[PDB]
Symmetry: C2
Subunit: 228 residues, 2 copies
Amino acid sequence: DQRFGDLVFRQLAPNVWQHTSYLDMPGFGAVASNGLIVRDGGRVLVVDTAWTDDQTAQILNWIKQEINLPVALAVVTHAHQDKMGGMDALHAAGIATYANALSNQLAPQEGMVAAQHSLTFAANGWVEPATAPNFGPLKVFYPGPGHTSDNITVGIDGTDIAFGGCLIKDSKAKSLGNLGDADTEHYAASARAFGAAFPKASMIVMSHSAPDSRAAITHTARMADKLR
Amino acid sequence: ETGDQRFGDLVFRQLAPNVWQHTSYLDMPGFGAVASNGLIVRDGGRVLVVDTAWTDDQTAQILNWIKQEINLPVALAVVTHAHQDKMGGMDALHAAGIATYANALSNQLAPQEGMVAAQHSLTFAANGWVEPATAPNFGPLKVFYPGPGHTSDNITVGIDGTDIAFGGCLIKDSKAKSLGNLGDADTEHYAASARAFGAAFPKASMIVMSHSAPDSRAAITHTARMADKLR
Ligand SMILES: O=C(CS)Nc1ccc2ccccc2c1
Ligand SMILES: O=C(CS)Nc1ccc2ccccc2c1
Ligand SMILES: [Zn+2]
Ligand SMILES: [Zn+2]
Ligand SMILES: [Zn+2]
Ligand SMILES: [Zn+2]
């Protein structure tokens, strides 16, 4: 764990790091959110902002210091503040941003800045390549509604890593923290679909837990089974 | 009502010179017959369908009524989410040679829901309007994804050249007491999605919906106000 400003960075693989940012909430301090940073040849790719613009600027600052390669694009995994709260820092820096079309449609209602480009998905959940050109190792998959209607996931090609975002919680989790915008009928199938889409991922990275094994997927699905 | 026609178990009501509502019924134990409405649109030399009936056999009845009453080929159908009242009859559409379209997400959910997927997937811009390249030759059908509400995948359809907009199961009429939301509803965004449908078709004065007879725009307002209370 490397501290840099108020953020934490953890190398997960030779070309992959987890970024972690924290926000005090009423009655619960320092709520963590994780995203990813990926080195792809001569460029860097980001998955998710931090909670705030200032924190997301610090992600860019850490990249400059520790990797020193331009950030070519970012993908954000749904329209909540932990994932899209720092869009302005990316746009200020000229970084192209991508999100599920539905995330961009929800953004204004959620008080988020929309990404500059929209991803669309085939009926099997895989991103349409016309909408995700030149994504390098980021393999984007829409698993179905679960945590939200718009949640998307990202496999990191060539590594053991798949990012479930806020859809997956770790195997020690006690609840899904599902809310009005969760789809409790389909959550379990969407969680299993993420697992089936990245069948050889052995390190599951998540927004609100430290990385876990594939048991995080199964444990999350089994919790969701009870919500139907 | 005077003017409604019957073919088998189906009821048809003409709403405008080139638009009819189709109504089919499914018996639900303890409650009885539940109506579901869709649309039939005559577009020059062809017919376009919005939504199947609850079953394959009921959907075949729609197509046979079209042949008898309109006698133009059915070019395509749009279906408005992956529930049985809207997609229960996909096999019948396919057997009749009708090209079918649904939200990509509807096609992704269809297998989990016991439904057959449409042959083609519609995708949507960030402003909700369908991407034209996914909706070829749709004529007067203007397809709009208003956001999550009744389900994550619910879509809506305005009929150009008419005063009609179809809210499917997202919109209930101005006399409705509840929304009937289940685990797949998005109760946080439902209200804004209903209002977005109204804003997408701001001149429509006849609102058609799946589970109420046609209403004024009060159906949109009342639906959104009911949804406000679920947040
Ligand atoms: O995590 C997300 C988006 S997935 N949002 C929040 C919002 C408020 C919270 C309050 C206390 C603890 C965690 C919280 C997490
Ligand atoms: O099954 C669907 C799919 S949207 N819709 C309805 C609509 C109204 C109903 C009323 C009583 C019982 C079941 C009902 C089911
Ligand atoms: Zn979230
Ligand atoms: Zn989150
Ligand atoms: Zn429905
Ligand atoms: Zn319905």
